[PDB]
Amino acid sequence: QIDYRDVFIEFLTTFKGNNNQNKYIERINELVAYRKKSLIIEFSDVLSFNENLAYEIINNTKIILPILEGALYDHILQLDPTYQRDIEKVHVRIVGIPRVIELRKIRSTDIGKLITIDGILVKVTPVKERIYKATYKHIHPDCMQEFEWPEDEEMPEVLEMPTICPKCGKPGQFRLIPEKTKLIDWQKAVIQERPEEVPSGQLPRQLEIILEDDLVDSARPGDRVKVTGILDIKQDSPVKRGSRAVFDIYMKVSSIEVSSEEDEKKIKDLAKDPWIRDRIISSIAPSIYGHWELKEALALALFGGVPKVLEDTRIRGDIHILIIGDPGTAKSQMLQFISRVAPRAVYTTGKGSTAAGLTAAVVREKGTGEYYLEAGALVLADGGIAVIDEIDKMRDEDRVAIHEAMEQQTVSIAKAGIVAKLNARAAVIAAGNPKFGRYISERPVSDNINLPPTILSRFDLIFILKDQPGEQDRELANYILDVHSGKSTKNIIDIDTLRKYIAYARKYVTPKITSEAKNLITDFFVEMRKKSSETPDSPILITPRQLEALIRISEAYAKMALKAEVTREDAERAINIMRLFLESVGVDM
Amino acid sequence: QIDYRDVFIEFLTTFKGNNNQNKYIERINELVAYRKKSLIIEFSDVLSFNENLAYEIINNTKIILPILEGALYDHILQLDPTYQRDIEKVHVRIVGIPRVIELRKIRSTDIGKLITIDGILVKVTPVKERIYKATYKHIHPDCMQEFEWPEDEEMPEVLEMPTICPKCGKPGQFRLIPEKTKLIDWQKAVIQERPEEVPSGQLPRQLEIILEDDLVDSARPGDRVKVTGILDIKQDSPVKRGSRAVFDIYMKVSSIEVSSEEDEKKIKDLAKDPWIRDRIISSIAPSIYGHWELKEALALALFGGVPKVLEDTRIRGDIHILIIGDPGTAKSQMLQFISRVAPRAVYTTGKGSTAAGLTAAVVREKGTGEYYLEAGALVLADGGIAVIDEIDKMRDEDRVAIHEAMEQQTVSIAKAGIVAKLNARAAVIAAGNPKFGRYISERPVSDNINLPPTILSRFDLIFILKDQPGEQDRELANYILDVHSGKSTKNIIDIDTLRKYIAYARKYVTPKITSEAKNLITDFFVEMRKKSSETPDSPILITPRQLEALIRISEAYAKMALKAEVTREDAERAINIMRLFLESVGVDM
Amino acid sequence: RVIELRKIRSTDIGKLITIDGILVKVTPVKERIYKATYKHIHPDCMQEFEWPEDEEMPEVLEMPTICPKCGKPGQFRLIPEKTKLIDWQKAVIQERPEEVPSGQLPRQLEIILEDDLVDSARPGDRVKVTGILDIKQDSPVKRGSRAVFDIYMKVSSIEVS
DNA sequence: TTTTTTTTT
Ligand SMILES: [Mg+2]
Ligand SMILES: [Mg+2]
Ligand SMILES: [Zn+2]
Ligand SMILES: [Zn+2]
Ligand SMILES: [Zn+2]
C-alpha cells in the first residue's frame, strides 16, 4: 500500500500535453478563477503517466476518489486561500473509462463497478434537494436536545428516523430541523439506448440515472450522452411487505459528456480555399446523382440566416425548403442525410405526426391530477432543423397548426387553464408528392400542388422535381451500380468534419449586409413583384416574405465561407438560386 | 453589542428624500391613519443611511427582523396609543434586495438566505387559516385541563399531536379547542419564470410561494411580480416513510411588488405637446411600413372608451377590431407588438385554443375529490386586451364561446355542478385570412370573410389589407432593408414609457361628451341610416350599435390626449375613421 | 356586523357577523348526534351510558375509551334508540358577481343549518345569513402537515331577499 | 370534467 496523494499531485503538476503546456495546471487555474468546484481528468493521460494509478481508479473507486479529492483541495487551497469559504469541497471526474457496456447487456456482475454507458437522453426532472445529513430534535418534556442523526455515516437513500435519543437514551418522537439540515442538489434523468443497437423486432430499453451537485442541468432532452458511474439497485416502497423482492437498477453519474482547439484549426484552414462553397455543396448526399440545385438549397438551410432581435419585435433567420417531386426521385434520401449531418435534427413524417405531437401536448399527471405541458417535435428542435417527410399526407386541420411556429417561431397554448408561449426557432424541411402522385404537365400549377397559398408563402424556396426519362439514364444507372459495388466518391468532406464545420459557423459567424448587396436585392425584388402581377393565376404569391428570404439566403452564403460581410458576390448567388425556384414553379424571369 | 433599534428609529424619522419631506415619517403617519400594519422600506435608502445596518438585515434577517418590529411598534405606540386593541403587531418589509437570482439557477447554497425572484404568477389558492399556537384539552376522566400545546416555540408547518399531558404527565386523548386556538391567514401561489429566461429546447420551471397575513390577495394570476423572501424545503408526509428522502423547495414571501413620481411628471409634460396624438400613432409598430389608418385603430383600442353603467343595463366601453388581409401583410407582427405594449394583454391563436381554455376549466382535486374552476384566457384578460390570431381557423364549437364575451362582456359557466357568471370586460383584437387566401375585390365581403354574419355585427371596426404590387414596392423594400441593417426611426416614444402612458390614461382620465359634440354624431349617424336603405344589399347594417361605437371612438381620442372633455375636433376625427371603415368594407359614400 | 365574503380575515372567527350571497347548493336534510348513548360490550359490564356527559357532543365523533360505570376498557356499542338527534343541513354561499374583483373567480363559503332552519331557502336564491364563523375539522388524527384549515359558517338566522 | 390517440357505434 503506497500513498497516491503525491503521485496524483505530481501527475497534475508535471503532465505534458500535446504542446507540453501542462494542461491540467491550466484547468486548475481556470477552476480557481471561476470557482468551478469540478475537475475533469482524461483517463488515457493518467494511464500514460502511471498505469498503477489508473488501475486503482477503475477498481478501487469507492475508497480512492475521496482521497484524491482531499489532496486536490489542499493543493488548490494552498494556491489560493480565498478559494476557501466559497467552495467547501471539489470533485474529481474521470473521463475515458475503457469499460463500456451496452444498456441491454447489463448483468449482476456489473453492479458495484465503474462503467460507461452511451445513450440518448429522454426525460429530465426539475432540480430538487436531497438530505445527506439530518438534524432532528427529541421533543419530550425532559430532553430539548438536537443532534445529527446519521453518526459517522452519510444519510442513506431511505429516509430513516432515530428510535432512541442519543442524548438521553429514551424513545419518543423526533422533529426535523430544516435550518441545520445539510442538503445536496438532486436531479433524475432517463437515458435510452441508441436506435442503431436495438435488436430486431424489439422496443428500446430505458435506464434511470441520477445527477447530483454541479452535474445537474448538464444536458437537454434528445442529446447523445456518455455517462460514467456506479450502478445500484433502486428502492421505492420498502415499508410495506408483499414479496416484490425483485428490484430495478439505477445509475449514479460521476461524469457526463455531450456528443477543441485542434478541431477549430482544422475548420479554419478549410475556409481558406476559395472553392469552399463548391466543396460543401458536392459533399451533400454523395450517394445521390445530380440534383445540384437541390443540394445547394439544403446546404443553405443547414447554415441559415442571421436572426434579428429588436426592442419591439424579432425577425426569424431560418430558411424553409419545400420539395415536390414524382415518386422515385430520391427525395427521402437527402432528407435522411440532412437529419444525420445536422448538429441537431428531428425526423418526422406527415402520416405519423399529429398537431399535439408537433408543437405541444397537454397531459394530465395521474400522480397529482393536474395538467402540464410536454414539448413537441418543433420545441425539441429549437435551434436545429425539423424534417417533415410526406407533408401532403397529413390532414389540413393538423397541418395548419404549424403556421405560427413556421413564421413567428413560437407556440401559443390556451388549454385546460394553461396559457404558455414556447420558443420554436427551428428550420423546417418538407417534401411531398403532387396531387395526382406524378406531375401532370398539361394541368396548371394550382391543381398540381394542392396546398393553400398561406403555407406556400412561408417557404423560402420551393422546388418541383420531375422524373423525365432521357439521355441521362445511362450515367444515372452507372452511378447507382457503383454505389452498390462499394465504390465511393473521393474529395468529399466526411460527415463528422462537416457537422463540426456547420456548428462552428452557426456560433461564431454573423455576416453584415453591405451597400452593394442592398441595391441588388432591392432591384430584383421590385422587378420580381412586377412580373407576378402579370399572371395572377399562379398559386404562389410574391409577398414581402420573399424579400426577407433574399436577405436570409445572402447571409447563408456568406456564413458558408465564414465571411464577416455580405459582399456583392453573395448577392448574385442569392438571386441566381431564387431564379431557379421561380423558374421551376412556372414563373419566368 | 451594537443595537440597531435606535438607528432604525433614527432612520425612519431623520431620512431626507429627494423632495426633502421625510417620506418614511409620512409612511408611518399613513400607516397609523389607515391601520396598514405593514411598512415598506427600500434597501437602497438603508445602504445610504448606514452600510452596517444594510448589511445586517440582508444577511441576518432571521433574528434582526423581530427585533426591528419592537422598535417600530414602540415608536408607533408613543405616536398614537390608540393603535393598540386593533393591531397586535406590525410587519416591516424590505424591497430592492440586490440578491437577485434566476429561478432556474437556484441551488443548495441559497436555502435560508434573503433572495428575490422575478417571475409570472400563474396560480392563486383561496385564503385559508393556519394554526401557529393550538390549545388542547386532555380527554382523560382525571384531567379536564386545557393547555396550549407548543410551549416556548411556534407551531411548526407540520401539526404535531401531543402524547403526554403536561399538566398531569398522563397520556391518552386530547381534544383541540378552536376558541383559544391562534390562527393566521394563509395563501399559496405558484411563480413561473419569464419566457425570455427559458433555455432553448426546454420547458419553463415553477416555484411555489406562500403568502401570509396581509400579503394575501395582493396579486392576480397573469401578473408579473417580484417577490423577496426565504427559501425552505417542503414537507408533505413526514410521518409516512417510503425512502425518497428528496424534498422540493418553496419560498416564504416577505414582500411582493407587482410590475413612481418622476414618471408621473414625465408623462404629464409629454401630453402638453399638441401633436401628441400624431406622435403616439407613429410609435405603434415602428418596424412596419405604411398601414397608417390601421395603426390609428390599434391605438384607439389600447385606450378605449369609458363604460356607462345604468340602473338596468351597461354600455360596453371597449373597442373590437377585426383585421382581414392577404398573407404576408404583417398582420401578426403588430398583434405581437400590441400584446407587448399593452399593460395587460393575452395572445392566443385559433388552433391552440379550446372552449375550456378560453373561458374556464374545471379541475378535480385528487385528494378531496372536489371540482373547482380555473381562469381562462378571456377571464385573465379582464380589464385588458385579448388577441386572437387566425380566428378563421378555430373550430366553431369554440368560436361560440366568445359570442357572449364580445357583446355581453360576461362568461357563463354551467358544468360539473358549478354555476357562475364571470366578467370578461376585455377588448378583442382578431386577425384572419380571406376565404381563398388572396382577397377578391369583385366578390362581396360575405363570401370572403368565411365567418358567420352574426360575429361581424359585434366588431366596431373591420379593416381589409390588400397586397397589390405597385409603385410602393421600392419604398417598402428600402424600409425593410433599413430595419435589417440596424437603422431605427427617431422621435418615437419608447415601449416602456408608452406602456406607462397608457396605464395612466386608463386610470385617471374620464372624458365627458359635450352637447355640441353630440350634434355631430347624431347628425352623422342619421346619414348612415339613409344610405343603409339606399343600398340594403351590403352585408354591413347601420344598427344602433354603430351609433354607440361612434361615441366610444371619440372618447378614446380624448383619452389619448389626456383631456377631460370631448371637444368637436375629436368628434370629426371619429367620423373620419368610421368613414374609411365603410369605404374599405365596400360601402362608398 | 356586515363583512364582504372576500374580506373575511383571521380576526373575524368567533364573532357574530352577517354575510350576503347567493345559494348554489343545498344538501338533503340529515340528522346529527348531540348526545349519544353507548353500551359497553364486555361480558361483565352490560351497562348503558351517555358518553358525552356534562358536555354537548362535539362535531368530531369520539367514542369512549374507559367505561364510566365498570371502569374498564373494551368494546362500546352505540344505541340509536336511546340517543337524541337534531336536524342538520349543509349549504354553500357564493358572493354576488358585482362583488367579484377584476380578473378573479368568485369565492365560496360553507354554511350549516340546524333545527327549524333546514330547508329555509332553495338553491339560486339571494340570502343574508347571520351567525358565528368557525374552522373545519375533517381528520385531525392524520398527520403529515396540513396545519392549515378551512372556515365554515354556523347560521343563527337567515332571510331571503 | 378535459386533452389525447385510438377503435368503435
Ligand atoms: Mg419519399
Ligand atoms: Mg400571421
Ligand atoms: Zn432525548
Ligand atoms: Zn392531563
Ligand atoms: Zn364497562
PDB file of C-alpha atoms (C1' of nucleotides) in Angstrom, chain A residues 354 362 364 371 415-416, chain D residues 1-6:
ATOM      1  CA  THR A 354     -50.265  14.946 -35.012  1.00  0.00           C
ATOM      2  CA  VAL A 362     -51.206  18.888 -22.570  1.00  0.00           C
ATOM      3  CA  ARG A 364     -52.758  15.063 -17.041  1.00  0.00           C
ATOM      4  CA  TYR A 371     -52.364  19.218 -16.313  1.00  0.00           C
ATOM      5  CA  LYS A 415     -55.836  24.724 -22.946  1.00  0.00           C
ATOM      6  CA  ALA A 416     -57.083  23.374 -19.606  1.00  0.00           C
TER       7      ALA A 416
ATOM      8  C1'  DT D   1     -64.534  17.459 -16.342  1.00  0.00           C
ATOM      9  C1'  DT D   2     -60.656  17.911 -20.437  1.00  0.00           C
ATOM     10  C1'  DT D   3     -56.910  16.552 -23.887  1.00  0.00           C
ATOM     11  C1'  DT D   4     -55.251  12.938 -26.308  1.00  0.00           C
ATOM     12  C1'  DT D   5     -54.870   8.626 -29.636  1.00  0.00           C
ATOM     13  C1'  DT D   6     -57.439   5.015 -30.770  1.00  0.00           C
TER      14       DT D   6
END
